[PDB]
Amino acid sequence: DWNNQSIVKTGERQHGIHIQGSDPGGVRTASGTTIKVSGRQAQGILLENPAAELQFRNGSVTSSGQLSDDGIRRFLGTVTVKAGKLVADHATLANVGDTWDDDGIALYVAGEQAQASIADSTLQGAGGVQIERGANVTVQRSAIVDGGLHIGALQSLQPEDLPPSRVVLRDTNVTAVPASGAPAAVSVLGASELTLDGGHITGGRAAGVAAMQGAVVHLQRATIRRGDALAGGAVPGGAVPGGAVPGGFGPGGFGPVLDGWYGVDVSGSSVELAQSIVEAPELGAAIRVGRGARVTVPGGSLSAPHGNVIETGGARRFAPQAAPLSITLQAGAHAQGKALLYRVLPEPVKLTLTGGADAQGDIVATELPSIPGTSIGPLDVALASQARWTGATRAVDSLSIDNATWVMTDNSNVGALRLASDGSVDFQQPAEAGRFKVLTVNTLAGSGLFRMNVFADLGLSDKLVVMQDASGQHRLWVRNSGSEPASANTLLLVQTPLGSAATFTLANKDGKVDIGTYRYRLAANGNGQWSLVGAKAPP
Numbered sequence: 001d002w003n004n005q006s007i008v009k010t011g012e013r014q015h016g017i018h019i020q021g022s023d024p025g026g027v028r029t030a031s032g033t034t035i036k037v038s039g040r041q042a043q044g045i046l047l048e049n050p051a052a053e054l055q056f057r058n059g060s061v062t063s064s065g066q067l068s069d070d071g072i073r074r075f076l077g078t079v080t081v082k083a084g085k086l087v088a089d090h091a092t093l094a095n096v097g098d099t100w101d102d103d104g105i106a107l108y109v110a111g112e113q114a115q116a117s118i119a120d121s122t123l124q125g126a127g128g129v130q131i132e133r134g135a136n137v138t139v140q141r142s143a144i145v146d147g148g149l150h151i152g153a154l155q156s157l158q159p160e161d162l163p164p165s166r167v168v169l170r171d172t173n174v175t176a177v178p179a180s181g182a183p184a185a186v187s188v189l190g191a192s193e194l195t196l197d198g199g200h201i202t203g204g205r206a207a208g209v210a211a212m213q214g215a216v217v218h219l220q221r222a223t224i225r226r227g228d229a230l231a232g233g234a235v236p237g238g239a240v241p242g243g244a245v246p247g248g249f250g251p252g253g254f255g256p257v258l259d260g261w262y263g264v265d266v267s268g269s270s271v272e273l274a275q276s277i278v279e280a281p282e283l284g285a286a287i288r289v290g291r292g293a294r295v296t297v298p299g300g301s302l303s304a305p306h307g308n309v310i311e312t313g314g315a316r317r318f319a320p321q322a323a324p325l326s327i328t329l330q331a332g333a334h335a336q337g338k339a340l341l342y343r344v345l346p347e348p349v350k351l352t353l354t355g356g357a358d359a360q361g362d363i364v365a366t367e368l369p370s371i372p373g374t375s376i377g378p379l380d381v382a383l384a385s386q387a388r389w390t391g392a393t394r395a396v397d398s399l400s401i402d403n404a405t406w407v408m409t410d411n412s413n414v415g416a417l418r419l420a421s422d423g424s425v426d427f428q429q430p431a432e433a434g435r436f437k438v439l440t441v442n443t444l445a446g447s448g449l450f451r452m453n454v455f456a457d458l459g460l461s462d463k464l465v466v467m468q469d470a471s472g473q474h475r476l477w478v479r480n481s482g483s484e485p486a487s488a489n490t491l492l493l494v495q496t497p498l499g500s501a502a503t504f505t506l507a508n509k510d511g512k513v514d515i516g517t518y519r520y521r522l523a524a525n526g527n528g529q530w531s532l533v534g535a536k537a538p539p
Contacts, residue, residue: 065102442466461492
């Protein structure tokens with residue numbers, strides 16, 4: 001059709017290849033062809049026919065004019081598909097227009113009958129790839145070199161309708177260079193769906209990946225870092241940003257809605273991370289959740305060494321009606337930060353760790369933004385099936401520990417503590433002697449295990465305080481963390497209300513623990529205290 005040819009156009013809206021609405025349907029093929037356009041409102045490729053298809057293989061497409069759209073708002077791409085199917089294979093696509101004079105979009109696919117299949121190609125330009133309004137796009141073994149990947153929209157009040165944009169990426173890297181002022185490297189907004197398997201996602205002014213307003217995202221075998229750089233025309237300057245330009249009705253590159261640097265920023269949407277790596281900068285968080293967001297993470301890693309693994313916000317008013325924020329780490333997911341979780345606004349939060357999830361850091365919250373006590377949504381956390389949480393809190397309302405463990409690293413406050421099937425609270429052995437900890441809780445229930453440190457020689461031990469109601473059948477295992485005692489001393493391990501039904505048994509071998517020449521056994525004389533008593537051992 002247009003094989004091994006050079007198409008060079010310079011006039012206003014003088015496209016390299018244009019398949020119109022008044023043209024016939026059918027497959028057009030281009031192989032070994034290079035397209036270069038520079039006129040105003042001229043794309044390299046323009047597809048506007050639902051029955052048409054274009055196979056563009058082993059060629060290159062470049063444009064440098066302002067690709068402003070006649071219909072209010074919008075900028076188009078060097079390759080734009082408004083209807084029909086584009087199949088690009090081993091292609092070199094580049095929008096080389098002034099950053100100033102144009103959005104630099106390399107590929108724009110929009111509409112219910114707009115489709116695109118991109119394989120083994122590179123897409124260059126500061127506006128990246130923009131997909132919306134029910135388009136369907138598959139991208140394989142490629143790379144969006146510097147403008148990022150932007151699916152869907154918000155605001156833009158203009159005749160709308162039905163289907164979601166559906167985008168599938170496989171082994172394709174996406175980078176949003178600082179120049180390309182894209183808020184996120186990958187943004188999925190509104191009725192949009194993204195499936196990503198394999199690939200490196202780097203950049204974004206405010207986030208690596210942003211999922212807003214009903215978006216549905218599925219990341220697998222991916223890495224999400226803030227760092228990056230490059231992609232483009234020639235070598236002038238790196239990223240304006242003292243630019244500020246003609247072009248018309250068009251933003252650098254889309255999103256976001258919140259800012260600082262978050263690996264994954266989810267609001268009113270759902271994101272699934274599977275075997276991926278997320279690295280947050282000192283300032284920010286691996287994952288930020290708001291407005292009923294749902295995030296799930298099997299395997300992989302979440303690291304925020306100098307910050308928060310998870311940040312929860314989005315919603316200034318708590319409403320019992322609405323569904324809470326939900327974060328689940330399962331299938332051996334690893335997480336590590338100063339704070340595992342950090343609450344910023346009053347919306348309820350549910351944090352679940354299961355399937356050998358291994359999380360590290362404290363759970364922190366922000367006292368109160370005036371909203372009277374019961375105007376604050378609860379912070380509930382659940383540990384199950386071998387998961388492990390090592391950190392401390394003063395902000396968890398309820399904690400269930402079922403066949404999993406909480407390694408408590410410092411004095412902690414928990415509203416209601418429920419244990420089951422060998423769930424345990426392990427009072428971490430301190431580095432310094434006599435540095436006992438206190439776990440204070442309102443209620444205790446179920447059947448669990450507490451590993452508690454005893455400093456016989458100082459007459460000190462860790463302590464469990466239940467202020468309102470202790471019930472259940474629990475076990476206490478004593479860790480000899482000091483030296484031998486020189487006389488008989490008794491340690492107050494557990495304080496419970498006088499009536500309390502709870503029962504505690506020493507789990508140490510034979511119901512006793514020998515430290516030096518002293519033997520300690522657990523005793524309760526009905527008053528609400530459980531004490532490790534300890535007396536001279538028998539010869």
